[PDB]
């Protein structure tokens, strides 16, 4: 038995979020319970001069 051959090319350009300059705008947090969370809220109290 004799075979017919083919070639695989495997190289890729890897990219990462934290290395990007766009990441500077973000504050990156991991939270493994995010599926349970419905809405996150953040509230402020201000008095005027």
């Amino acid at each position: 038995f004799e075979a017919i051959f083919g070639t695989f090319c495997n190289r890729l350009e890897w990219v990462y979020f934290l290395t990007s300059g766009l990441a500077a705008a973000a504050h990156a947090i991991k939270f493994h319970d995010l599926n349970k969370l419905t809405t996150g809220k953040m509230l402020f109290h201000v008095q005027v001069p």
Partner: protein
């Protein structure tokens, strides 16, 4: 009384297809990086004998 084959025949890999693989590697491998085609001692093709 008749002498008959005691067992089934085997899959045998053609020695030629090593040459095709080596040609593909010659095209694809880096400059002088490939070395499997040259060796010392008796030459040896991968076989199931």
């Amino acid at each position: 009384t008749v002498s008959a084959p005691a067992t089934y025949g085997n899959f045998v890999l053609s020695p030629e297809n090593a040459v095709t693989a080596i040609s593909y590697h010659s095209i694809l491998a880096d400059f002088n990086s490939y070395k499997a085609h040259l060796t010392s001692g008796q030459p040896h093709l991968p076989n199931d004998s």
